[PDB]
């Protein structure tokens, strides 16, 4: 781990720095987290991947079509990147590498993107693309990390689909292909077509097991909550802080989580 | 037929609007979206005296009456099927005060 | 009766986008603005004479004809046993209260 020592001392210290410095007011601390990362502006590929999945969510908002502008406006600069309907995905598709496989995913545009059921396959596809992206890092304990929450996202999402979507007509094999190395494969979660079988499958996932637990939310939640736990528990993985790799990522996410659990709290 | 608020606390209203259609009763193609707050919402008892009374939405929404403005509505206490309302919390607890049905439900 | 249940309808409500919060964060906002897995807003109402007077049977969301839903969302199940119990709620309240004014 000498080449931290060599190059990229300074950068990475203020990275760490500004990680340990984080233990409406969600969307001022996303912003803040921003400017920080603006003023910044190896852990440089992972903090970029981490603002192309936090800007594939809101080119998916833009993507779709109602104040659009004022919405992702609202965003955090971060997840509304400023250089970012069948026209607006694909000028989202350039310099945002999530956004071209959210189009593939949309072949409708906006009404393959519907916020109910469709909105939910096409973000997939983003943060599939997104994934990819944080792969091409070329690996690493915190490419590791990544695709262990990849795996998560991919096993809430089946069992989402599962749950709910079945309803929504979406095919187990696309739903499979819509949850999402480790993301890619989870047939142990989509053997089950029951929900509450199903449930029980994708709990058996290594990432959302022992982390769940009673899971009284979580598991049983649509969209992608079924990890819940397993999202604090990689943030505690940040906790850690071991030095010398990339995790301006892991300072992302910690920032996120501090701002989500601050947006909890609300009043007292 | 439907029920339009066009304005409330919305917290509620948002997901109590439409999930998978009904148009949430015409209030996003038609009347105003059920946000609040923004402005007066006096101009949300003009549009309950226009488009709820047009037949196509049946009842209203207002919060708390205290930022509410309802006091402008206070008069529509007559033909209730009109214009009837309950004040919910929404975050903004119920506060009795001159209002679309308050008053009468009340009494 | 329908107005000691409005108050505990809304902190119930509560409970939903606090759900909602805790697991999707943020709604879609603009015109889709998610929270919504059930009662779409179409109703049915119709004057009935009772006692020899029109009683309008107003019968809101959650109680009235042509209500739809969309599957579940992270907290649609919370959003659909909380808002839209509300609006059954609000169904009969504003049934009652037309029935009471014409019967006043």
């Known amino acids: 781990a000498m080449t931290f020592n060599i190059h990229g001392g300074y950068l990475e210290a203020i990275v760490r720095g500004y990680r340990a410095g984080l233990l409406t007011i969600v969307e001022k601390c996303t912003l803040k987290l921003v400017d920080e990362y603006k003023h910044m502006l190896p852990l440089s590929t992972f903090l970029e991947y981490i603002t192309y999945g936090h800007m594939i969510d809101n080119v998916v908002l833009i993507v779709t079509g109602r104040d659009v502008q004022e919405l992702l406006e609202k965003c955090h600069p971060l997840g509304m990147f400023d250089s970012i309907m069948r026209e607006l995905y694909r000028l989202v598709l350039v310099d945002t ?31 599939l693309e997104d994934f990819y992206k944080f792969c091409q890092k070329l690996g690493g304990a915190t490419a590791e990390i990544m695709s262990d929450l990849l795996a998560f996202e991919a096993d809430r999402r089946a069992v989402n689909i599962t749950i709910n979507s079945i309803g929504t007509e979406l095919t187990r094999d696309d739903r499979r292909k819509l949850y999402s190395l480790y993301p890619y494969g989870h047939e142990e979660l989509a053997v089950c077509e029951d929900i509450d079988q199903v449930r029980g499958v994708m709990e058996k ?20 909550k079924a990890f819940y736990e397993e999202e604090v528990k990689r943030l505690c993985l940040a906790f850690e802080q071991q030095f010398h790799y990339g995790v301006f990522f892991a300072y992302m996410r910690l920032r996120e989580q501090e701002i989500r659990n601050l947006m909890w709290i609300s009043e007292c | 037929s439907a029920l339009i608020a ?65 006091r402008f509505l206070v008069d529509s206490y007559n033909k209730p099927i009109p214009a009837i309302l309950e004040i919910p919390s929404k975050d903004h607890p119920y506060d009795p005060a001159h209002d679309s049905v308050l008053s009468r439900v009340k009494n | 009766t329908t107005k000691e249940s409005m108050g505990e309808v809304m902190k119930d409500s509560s409970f939903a986008l606090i759900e909602a919060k805790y697991v999707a964060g943020e709604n879609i906002k603009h015109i889709v603005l998610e929270n919504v897995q059930n009662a779409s807003i179409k109703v049915r109402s119709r004057q009935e004479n009772i006692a020899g007077v029109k009683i309008p049977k107003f019968e809101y969301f959650t109680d009235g004809e042509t209500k739809n839903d969309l599957t579940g969302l992270a907290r649609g199940g919370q959003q659909v046993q909380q808002c839209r119990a509300a609006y059954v709620k609000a169904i009969e309240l504003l049934v009652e209260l037309a029935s009471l004014q014409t019967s006043f």
């Not at chain 1, 996932?205 to 992608?224: R, T, W």
């Not at chain 2, 259609?21 to 209030?27: E, I, S, T």
């Not at chain 2, 105003?32 to 209203?60: G, P, Q, R």
């Open chain 1, 205 to 224: 996932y290594p990432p959302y097991q022992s982390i769940f637990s009673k899971l009284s939310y979580g598991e049983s939640q649509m969209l992608d």
């Open chain 1, 97 to 127: 590498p999530l956004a071209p496989y959210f189009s593939e995913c949309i072949t409708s545009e906006d009404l393959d993107d519907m916020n109910i059921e469709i909105m939910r396959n096409t973000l997939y596809k983003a943060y």
């Open chain 2, 6 to 70: 066009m304005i409330a606390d919305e917290d509620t209203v948002t997901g109590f609007l439409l999930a998978g259609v009904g148009n949430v009763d015409l209030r996003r193609k038609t009347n105003y979206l059920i946000v609040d707050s923004k402005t007066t919402v006096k101009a949300i008892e003009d549009a309950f005296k226009e488009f709820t009374t047009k037949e196509d939405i049946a009842i209203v929404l207002i919060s708390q009456y205290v930022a509410n403005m309802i």
